[PDB]
A paper describes a structure:
We crystallized and solved 3D crystal structures for two catalytically active forms of Δ117Pro: one in its [name]-free form, the second in its [name]-bound state with fused [name] at the C-terminal part (Δ117Pro-E/A-[name]), and one catalytically defective Δ117Procm form with S159/A mutation. In Δ117Pro chain A, it is rotated away from the catalytic triad H49, thereby disrupting the functionality of the catalytic triad since D92 is too far from H49 to ensure any proton transfer. This shift could also render the Glu-binding site unsuitable for cleavage site recognition.
Its cis and trans activity is mediated by the naturally unfolded virus-genome-linked protein ([name]). Here, we solved a full Pro–[name] 3D structure of [name] (RGMoV) that demonstrates the structural changes in three different conformations due to [name] interaction with Pro.
Residue numbers in the entry: 7 to 152, 155 to 197
Amino acid sequence: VSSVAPGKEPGSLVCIQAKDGKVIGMGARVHCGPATVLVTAGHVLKKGMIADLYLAKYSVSSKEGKRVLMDPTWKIEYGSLNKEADVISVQVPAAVWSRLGVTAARVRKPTVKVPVLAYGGEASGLLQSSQGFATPDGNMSVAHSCRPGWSGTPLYAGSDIVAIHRRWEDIGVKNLATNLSIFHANCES
């Protein structure tokens, strides 16, 4: 488990913070057909129905975190709050991403066994990463050695994304992540 230098995480990665700064989940901007969407975990987004969630990302110029208030009425495209703990996506205005310097990533459907990095942590400027693999036959995982704020964070193959982190398994420090292949094919129509 490595400690990533400030602002050296993928350009598509965002923290999802509470009003006080508590990092409760992560997300990413992704290309979805002709637009982009925030993609995250359903259970992270549910929390913004009763309180103010904030999209945040570390600024290089300013040398500190920046945030923008999320609007619960931004339209959810893929997924559902009501009855699902799967992946969920949101039409975030491009103006929000522009303010946050977030660039959008692509969904790769891995061809061969490939290394993957997942990111999370306690502030936008103090993130950590975790290693593992993505194999075409189903299974994609990172391994933590020896936390719910990682919820919704992607598994990156370079700057492309292949899966989304649900949670960590009950002891063993292995990831259980949603394969983004149903998401992609939905996006691509």
